[PDB]
Design a protein around this motif. Structure first.
Motif, mmCIF file in Angstrom:
data_model
loop_
_atom_site.group_PDB
_atom_site.id
_atom_site.type_symbol
_atom_site.label_atom_id
_atom_site.label_comp_id
_atom_site.label_asym_id
_atom_site.label_seq_id
_atom_site.Cartn_x
_atom_site.Cartn_y
_atom_site.Cartn_z
ATOM 1 N N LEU A 14 19.395 121.246 111.647
ATOM 2 C CA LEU A 14 18.803 120.036 112.211
ATOM 3 C C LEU A 14 18.354 120.149 113.662
ATOM 4 C CD1 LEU A 14 20.929 117.134 110.689
ATOM 5 C CD2 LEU A 14 18.695 118.012 110.054
ATOM 6 N N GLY A 16 17.774 122.897 117.314
ATOM 7 C CA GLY A 16 17.668 124.248 117.834
ATOM 8 C C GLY A 16 16.396 124.938 117.395
ATOM 9 N N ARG A 17 16.343 126.250 117.645
ATOM 10 C CA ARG A 17 15.146 127.015 117.300
ATOM 11 C C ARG A 17 14.914 127.120 115.796
ATOM 12 N NH1 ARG A 17 14.510 132.551 117.826
ATOM 13 N NH2 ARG A 17 16.208 132.850 119.322
ATOM 14 N N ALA A 19 15.454 124.644 113.417
ATOM 15 C CA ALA A 19 15.529 123.338 112.782
ATOM 16 C C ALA A 19 14.627 123.280 111.558
ATOM 17 C CB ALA A 19 15.142 122.243 113.768
ATOM 18 N N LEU A 125 10.930 123.948 102.951
ATOM 19 C CA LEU A 125 11.013 122.491 102.809
ATOM 20 C C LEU A 125 9.816 121.829 103.484
ATOM 21 C CD1 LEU A 125 12.782 119.651 102.514
ATOM 22 C CD2 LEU A 125 13.606 120.299 104.752
ATOM 23 N N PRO A 126 9.048 120.997 102.778
ATOM 24 C CA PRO A 126 7.802 120.469 103.341
ATOM 25 C C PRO A 126 8.013 119.229 104.201
ATOM 26 C CG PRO A 126 7.947 120.202 100.907
ATOM 27 C CD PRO A 126 9.324 120.427 101.451
ATOM 28 N N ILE A 127 7.348 119.210 105.358
ATOM 29 C CA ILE A 127 7.612 118.235 106.412
ATOM 30 C C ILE A 127 6.309 117.572 106.849
ATOM 31 C CG2 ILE A 127 8.667 117.867 108.665
ATOM 32 C CD1 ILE A 127 10.081 120.572 108.269
ATOM 33 N N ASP A 128 6.321 116.236 106.930
ATOM 34 C CA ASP A 128 5.455 115.482 107.850
ATOM 35 C C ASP A 128 3.974 115.509 107.460
ATOM 36 O OD1 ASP A 128 4.469 114.207 110.215
ATOM 37 O OD2 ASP A 128 6.204 114.996 111.301
ATOM 38 N N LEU D 49 16.981 105.028 106.727
ATOM 39 C CA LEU D 49 17.222 106.468 106.700
ATOM 40 C C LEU D 49 18.712 106.774 106.792
ATOM 41 C CD1 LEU D 49 15.214 109.021 108.956
ATOM 42 C CD2 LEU D 49 17.383 109.530 107.901
ATOM 43 N N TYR D 56 24.236 109.831 100.105
ATOM 44 C CA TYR D 56 24.195 111.219 99.655
ATOM 45 C C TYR D 56 25.485 111.946 100.005
ATOM 46 C CZ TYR D 56 21.993 115.380 97.903
ATOM 47 O OH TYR D 56 21.655 116.465 97.137
ATOM 48 N N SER F 70 10.693 125.735 122.587
ATOM 49 C CA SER F 70 11.055 126.679 121.532
ATOM 50 C C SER F 70 11.775 125.956 120.398
ATOM 51 C CB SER F 70 11.906 127.806 122.099
ATOM 52 O OG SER F 70 11.206 128.555 123.064
ATOM 53 N N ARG F 71 10.997 125.240 119.589
ATOM 54 C CA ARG F 71 11.492 124.523 118.422
ATOM 55 C C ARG F 71 10.296 124.204 117.543
ATOM 56 N NH1 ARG F 71 14.489 120.634 120.801
ATOM 57 N NH2 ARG F 71 12.543 119.510 121.185
ATOM 58 N N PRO F 72 10.479 124.052 116.234
ATOM 59 C CA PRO F 72 9.393 123.512 115.407
ATOM 60 C C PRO F 72 8.919 122.160 115.925
ATOM 61 C CG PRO F 72 11.044 124.474 114.020
ATOM 62 C CD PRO F 72 11.569 124.601 115.407
ATOM 63 N N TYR F 73 7.596 122.022 116.074
ATOM 64 C CA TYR F 73 6.970 120.865 116.726
ATOM 65 C C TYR F 73 7.393 120.748 118.189
ATOM 66 C CZ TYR F 73 5.765 119.446 111.993
ATOM 67 O OH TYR F 73 5.282 119.418 110.714
ATOM 68 N N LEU F 77 6.928 116.532 119.136
ATOM 69 C CA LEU F 77 7.979 115.589 118.790
ATOM 70 C C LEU F 77 9.172 115.799 119.711
ATOM 71 C CD1 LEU F 77 8.003 115.577 114.851
ATOM 72 C CD2 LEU F 77 6.482 114.387 116.443
ATOM 73 N N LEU F 82 12.016 114.908 115.217
ATOM 74 C CA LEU F 82 12.051 116.013 114.270
ATOM 75 C C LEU F 82 13.185 115.835 113.275
ATOM 76 C CD1 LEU F 82 11.239 118.707 113.140
ATOM 77 C CD2 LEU F 82 12.529 119.825 114.963
ATOM 78 N N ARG F 83 14.384 115.548 113.774
ATOM 79 C CA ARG F 83 15.546 115.408 112.909
ATOM 80 C C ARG F 83 15.371 114.286 111.891
ATOM 81 N NH1 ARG F 83 20.141 112.270 112.836
ATOM 82 N NH2 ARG F 83 22.045 113.319 112.121
ATOM 83 N N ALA F 84 14.633 113.241 112.242
ATOM 84 C CA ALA F 84 14.402 112.154 111.306
ATOM 85 C C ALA F 84 13.363 112.518 110.254
ATOM 86 C CB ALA F 84 13.982 110.897 112.063
ATOM 87 N N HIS F 85 12.358 113.319 110.616
ATOM 88 C CA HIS F 85 11.415 113.825 109.627
ATOM 89 C C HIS F 85 12.092 114.779 108.653
ATOM 90 C CE1 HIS F 85 7.380 112.331 110.562
ATOM 91 N NE2 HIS F 85 7.721 112.358 111.836
ATOM 92 N N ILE F 86 13.010 115.608 109.146
ATOM 93 C CA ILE F 86 13.694 116.573 108.296
ATOM 94 C C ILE F 86 14.539 115.861 107.254
ATOM 95 C CG2 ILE F 86 15.358 118.453 108.291
ATOM 96 C CD1 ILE F 86 14.419 119.095 111.145
ATOM 97 N N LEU F 87 15.245 114.806 107.660
ATOM 98 C CA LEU F 87 16.089 114.071 106.725
ATOM 99 C C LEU F 87 15.261 113.308 105.704
ATOM 100 C CD1 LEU F 87 18.322 114.962 108.441
ATOM 101 C CD2 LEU F 87 19.102 112.652 108.739
ATOM 102 N N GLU F 88 14.173 112.678 106.138
ATOM 103 C CA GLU F 88 13.333 111.960 105.193
ATOM 104 C C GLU F 88 12.766 112.901 104.144
ATOM 105 O OE1 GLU F 88 10.889 109.027 105.126
ATOM 106 O OE2 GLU F 88 12.106 107.603 106.284
ATOM 107 N N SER F 89 12.255 114.054 104.574
ATOM 108 C CA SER F 89 11.727 115.023 103.622
ATOM 109 C C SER F 89 12.786 115.453 102.613
ATOM 110 C CB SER F 89 11.173 116.231 104.366
ATOM 111 O OG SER F 89 10.823 117.252 103.457
ATOM 112 N N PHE F 90 13.948 115.884 103.093
ATOM 113 C CA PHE F 90 14.960 116.406 102.184
ATOM 114 C C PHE F 90 15.485 115.333 101.233
ATOM 115 C CE2 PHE F 90 19.664 116.883 101.714
ATOM 116 C CZ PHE F 90 19.605 117.692 100.602
ATOM 117 N N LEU F 91 15.711 114.111 101.723
ATOM 118 C CA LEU F 91 16.338 113.078 100.900
ATOM 119 C C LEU F 91 15.389 112.461 99.883
ATOM 120 C CD1 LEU F 91 18.506 111.129 103.464
ATOM 121 C CD2 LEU F 91 19.319 112.583 101.636
#
Ligand SMILES: [K+]
Ligand SMILES: [K+]
Ligand SMILES: [K+]
Ligand SMILES: [K+]
Ligand SMILES: [K+]
Ligand SMILES: [K+]
Ligand SMILES: [K+]
Ligand SMILES: [K+]
Ligand SMILES: [K+]
Ligand SMILES: [K+]
Ligand SMILES: [K+]
Ligand SMILES: [K+]
Ligand SMILES: [K+]
Ligand SMILES: [K+]
Ligand SMILES: [K+]
Ligand SMILES: [K+]
Ligand SMILES: [K+]
Ligand SMILES: [K+]
Ligand SMILES: [K+]
Ligand SMILES: [K+]
Ligand SMILES: [K+]
Ligand SMILES: [Mg+2]
Ligand SMILES: [Mg+2]
Ligand SMILES: [Mg+2]
Ligand SMILES: [Mg+2]
Ligand SMILES: [Mg+2]
Ligand SMILES: [Mg+2]
Ligand SMILES: [Mg+2]
Ligand SMILES: [Mg+2]
Ligand SMILES: [Mg+2]
Ligand SMILES: [Mg+2]
Lengths: 129, 66, 91, 101, 249, 99
Positions: A14, A16-17, A19, A125-128, D49, D56, F70-73, F77, F82-91
């Motif tokens: 979630l 860090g580099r 994520a 995993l697809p994002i955004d 969210l 879960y 040095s992070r995705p997006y 973001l 970012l952490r909220a997009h990751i959770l929405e996608s996975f769930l």
RNA sequence: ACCGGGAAGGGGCGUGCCCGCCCGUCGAACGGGGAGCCGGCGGAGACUCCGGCAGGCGCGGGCGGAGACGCGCCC
RNA sequence: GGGGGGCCCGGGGGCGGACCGCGCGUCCCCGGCCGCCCCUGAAAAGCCGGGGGGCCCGCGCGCCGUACCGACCGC
RNA sequence: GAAAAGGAGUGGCUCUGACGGGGUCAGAACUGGAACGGACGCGGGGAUCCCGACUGUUUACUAGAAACACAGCGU
């Protein structure tokens, strides 16, 4: 009812580099000062498209870190391994080991993919949208 | 303009990157004219002796005092 | 110690404009300066930002509402009647 | 209904006098993943969210999760606080029976 | 005489609307293939104030249905809409404030706004702050729907004309008195050069048909007929009656 | 003494990009020095808050490494988004499939 | 002369392919804009000359951190 | 809250470039807040980031304005 | 309404008290043609009647108003 942070579980990273990338829990460290941590191995890059028209394309890149569990989201998915047989503290400031440890996780992730094993683990995993 | 540690000073000389050096007496000031910056080093006169002997023979030195 | 007896916030107007107008403004202007409840925050931090536009200072959510109050009475009834019509559509 | 809630009220008070519990979302996640939560109780305006994630995590641990029928302010009132409570996690029922649910 | 004030406004120049810094024209989403066979999902991005307009506007982002990327729409906001909300457009959309549905699929009793008087025209009725239309009845054999406009008139429209569920936000705006000439100056500075207003009886006869005289007075009846010519059609045009009285029901 | 100075720019109309400060020179003189407008740093696409790590310099003057995180997006973001997009996608994948 | 989108409206390259809905190198010596400071010299010029010290735009000879964060290009 | 950290901050200091203290105000810019609107306070060139896919040393910087003045308009 | 109307004090010098190095505020003795905002700056007041509610606008060069506008009200 029951604890879930057990070795073999697959989590999503979630912060860090790395994520948004998947990883496994090698070990569930005890709880003391600083909170709660786990030894975690995971994929950093996945191979690319390979048309029939390639050693430089299709390699894997791994990372082995200690991570805070508040930075992990677990899943249902599972992944059996043997990586604890050589990952305890050789990954803890023991820099000389830590490089080479990553090398022998490239090989396994490399081996697993050719057999077409654990497809849900080695997919992105697809994002955004 | 900028200041410099002594070891970096000879390497710029060692690679022919200096154009002129000036020794200034006041603690001694050594000023080297490169293409980009003027560099200044401050040493006591005891220390500047050895450095100038090391002085590149291809590097013009001048002196100055008053 | 209480500073005025009746005019309240319309003391800013002085002796001007007559009694009927100042009576209307006391009610209108008290309403538009009020703090309302986030329908999401559940905290009492909603303030008007323009006519029709209301923002939680805690949620940061922005909402569309009345000119001088968060909810109007026509819109309360409309939401109530629309909800009952949908549930009736369910078999 | 009316008989039902006066038991839900009665149990919610029983825990806060004799039995452990925590209030808040970050304390609730750290306990569910460790299997200490006998019950989880949420408000009906819990952010969407965050609610998805709590369910879960609950199904993986087999921790029961219900939904209190009032805002996060009502839950604050119900367990006796002056602040809103999105998630309440019961660790030991103490003298509550928890059958009310 | 000379040309009177109402005759000079048709020519443009200083009487054109003050459109600088406006957000754009507000419309429903265009009817397309996906909406006719189903429903399309959008998300509320912002709620914005538009210059010269009482109700607010909403920016809503939809996916591009004929390519990649996004599509940005500008809606008149129903009351209760909020940033981050998910709306729906099409034949299979559900009954929630903010959704866009054909008026034939909407049950009688519902409040709607921004209604099309002919299909696919993108909405022209009940657009001002606080307004709404009612859905009165459906005539299935002729494929017409009956609605009640904000004036109380009744009207028949197609059943494939679309509408937005809810009523327009900003309601109650006119219940606050303008206290000062200055508050009226700021209101019309955002619309048009139409203020302040000089009375016809305050003018000379060259300027207006009501001008002149040793006392300020109109002189003849101020009811003018429907076929009066331009320059002549001032006062009360084609009035059925006049005066102040109750008893209307 | 008399410390008054004359205008430094082409015209004297004091707009927001024609502001000076005052400084004493090594020849004992009061000089004028332009005060540049300071641009904002980039802001988060979801929340509108300043992105952390980037100095308030126009990116033409910053090295490539200085312009990134040095992070995705990394610079799009704010880390929480970012952490909220990751959770929405996975769930959502967990609910649109397998119930 | 006055009025105007409903028109088979142009580009990247490298052949040959591929992509494409349709104006303005008109309009601001106060708006936006890549980058300048000190000392000196002349009868009349200087942020422009001379000396000194710089700045901008061009052209040619995968790692560290628990984390917040730290350390070539083309569509 | 407390303990320990990260990022921004037209600024200050020290070394380069190259006399010493202490105060009340004034002007200019900046900061975080708070208040106000039936008023909500430009645009574009240009430059950059993200996701996805394909893949040190030299030389130069053209054109135009630049003197002086309330010496301007009111014969 | 209201600075309503009306009253009293005010220099110089020698001191004292209060506030956490700094001005202010409060008080007292002594003294001078029976003087003190010593120049400068700076409302005359009150009782009423008519008109227009109010701030605002106008006949550049004989009219500033009781005329126009205005919020409100109505068709
Ligand atoms: K005429
Ligand atoms: K005429
Ligand atoms: K006419
Ligand atoms: K005319
Ligand atoms: K005209
Ligand atoms: K006007
Ligand atoms: K009028
Ligand atoms: K007349
Ligand atoms: K013509
Ligand atoms: K222009
Ligand atoms: K201009
Ligand atoms: K310009
Ligand atoms: K991106
Ligand atoms: K010149
Ligand atoms: K005295
Ligand atoms: K008048
Ligand atoms: K005034
Ligand atoms: K006159
Ligand atoms: K006059
Ligand atoms: K006057
Ligand atoms: K007049
Ligand atoms: Mg007249
Ligand atoms: Mg006439
Ligand atoms: Mg041009
Ligand atoms: Mg300019
Ligand atoms: Mg000159
Ligand atoms: Mg000159
Ligand atoms: Mg008057
Ligand atoms: Mg006046
Ligand atoms: Mg006159
Ligand atoms: Mg006069």
């Amino acid at each position: 009812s029951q604890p879930i942070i057990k070795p073999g579980l697959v989590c999503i990273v979630l912060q860090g580099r790395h994520a948004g990338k998947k990883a496994v829990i090698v070990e569930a460290l005890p709880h003391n000062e600083r909170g709660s941590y786990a030894i975690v191995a995971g994929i950093a890059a996945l191979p690319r498209r390979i048309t029939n028209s390639a050693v430089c394309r299709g390699r894997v890149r791994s990372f082995v870190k200690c991570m805070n569990v508040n930075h992990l989201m677990p899943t249902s998915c599972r992944l059996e391994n043997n990586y604890k047989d050589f990952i305890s503290t050789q990954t803890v400031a023991d820099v000389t080991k830590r490089r080479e440890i990553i090398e022998t996780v490239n090989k396994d992730f490399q081996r697993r993919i050719l057999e077409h094993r654990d497809t849900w683990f080695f997919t992105k995993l697809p994002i955004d949208a | 303009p900028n200041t410099i540690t002594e070891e970096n000073l000879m390497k710029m000389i060692a690679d022919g990157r200096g154009k002129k050096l000036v020794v200034k007496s006041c603690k001694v000031k050594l000023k080297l004219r490169t293409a980009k910056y003027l560099y200044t080093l401050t040493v006591p006169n005891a220390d500047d002796a050895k450095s100038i002997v090391k002085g590149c023979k291809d590097k013009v030195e001048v002196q100055y005092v008053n | 110690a209480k500073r005025t007896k009746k005019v309240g916030l319309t003391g800013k107007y002085g002796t001007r404009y007559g009694r009927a107008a100042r009576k209307q403004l006391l009610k209108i202007e008290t309403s538009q300066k009020a703090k309302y409840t986030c329908p999401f925050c559940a905290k009492d931090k909603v303030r008007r930002t323009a006519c029709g536009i209301w923002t939680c200072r805690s949620c940061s959510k922005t909402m569309a509402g009345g000119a001088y109050s968060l909810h109007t009475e026509p819109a309360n009834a409309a939401r109530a009647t629309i909800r009952r019509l949908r549930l009736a559509r369910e078999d | 209904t009316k008989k039902a809630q006066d038991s839900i009220s009665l149990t919610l008070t029983l825990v806060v006098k004799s039995g452990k519990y925590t209030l808040g979302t970050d304390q609730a996640i750290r306990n569910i993943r460790d299997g200490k939560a006998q019950l989880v109780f949420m408000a009906n305006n819990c952010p969407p969210l965050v609610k998805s994630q709590v369910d879960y995590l609950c199904h993986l641990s087999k921790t029961p999760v219900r939904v209190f029928a009032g805002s996060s302010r009502e839950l604050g009132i119900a367990v006796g606080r002056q602040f809103n409570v999105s998630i309440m996690t019961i660790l030991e029922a103490g003298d509550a029976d928890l059958t009310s649910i | 005489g000379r040309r009177i004030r109402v005759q000079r406004k048709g020519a443009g120049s200083v009487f054109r609307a003050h459109v600088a810094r406006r957000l754009g024209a507000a419309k429903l989403r265009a009817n397309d293939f996906a909406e006719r066979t189903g429903s399309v999902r959008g998300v509320v991005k912002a709620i914005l104030h538009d210059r010269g307009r009482g109700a607010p506007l909403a920016r809503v982002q939809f996916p591009n249905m004929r390519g990649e990327g996004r599509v940005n729409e500008l809606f008149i906001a129903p009351e209760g809409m909020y940033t981050g909300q998910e709306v729906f457009s099409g034949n299979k959309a559900t009954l929630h404030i903010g959704n866009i549905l054909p008026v034939g699929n909407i049950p009688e009793g519902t409040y709607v706004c921004n209604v099309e008087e002919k299909p696919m025209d993108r909405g022209c009725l009940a657009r001002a702050s606080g307004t709404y239309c009612l859905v009165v009845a459906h005539n299935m054999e002729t494929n017409k729907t009956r609605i009640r406009l904000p004036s109380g008139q009744k009207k028949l429209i197609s059943s494939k004309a679309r509408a937005m569920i809810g009523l327009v936000a900003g309601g109650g705006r006119t219940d606050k008195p303008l206290l000062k000439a200055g508050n009226a100056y700021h209101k019309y500075k955002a619309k048009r050069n139409c203020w302040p207003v000089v009375r016809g009886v305050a003018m000379n006869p060259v300027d207006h048909p009501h001008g002149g005289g040793n006392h300020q007075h109109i002189g003849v009846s101020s009811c003018v007929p429907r076929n009066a010519v331009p320059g002549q059609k001032v006062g009360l045009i084609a009035a059925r009656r006049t005066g102040c009285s109750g008893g209307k029901r | 003494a008399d410390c008054r100075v004359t205008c430094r720019f082409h015209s004297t109309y004091r707009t927001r990009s024609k502001i000076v400060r005052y400084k004493r020179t090594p020849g004992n003189r009061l000089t004028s020095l332009r005060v540049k407008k300071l641009p904002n740093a980039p802001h988060c696409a979801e929340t509108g808050k300043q992105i952390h790590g980037i100095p308030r310099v126009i990116p033409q003057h910053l090295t490539r490494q200085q312009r990134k995180v040095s992070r995705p997006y990394g610079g799009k973001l704010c880390g929480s988004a970012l952490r909220a997009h990751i959770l929405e996608s996975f769930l959502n994948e967990e609910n649109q499939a397998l119930r």
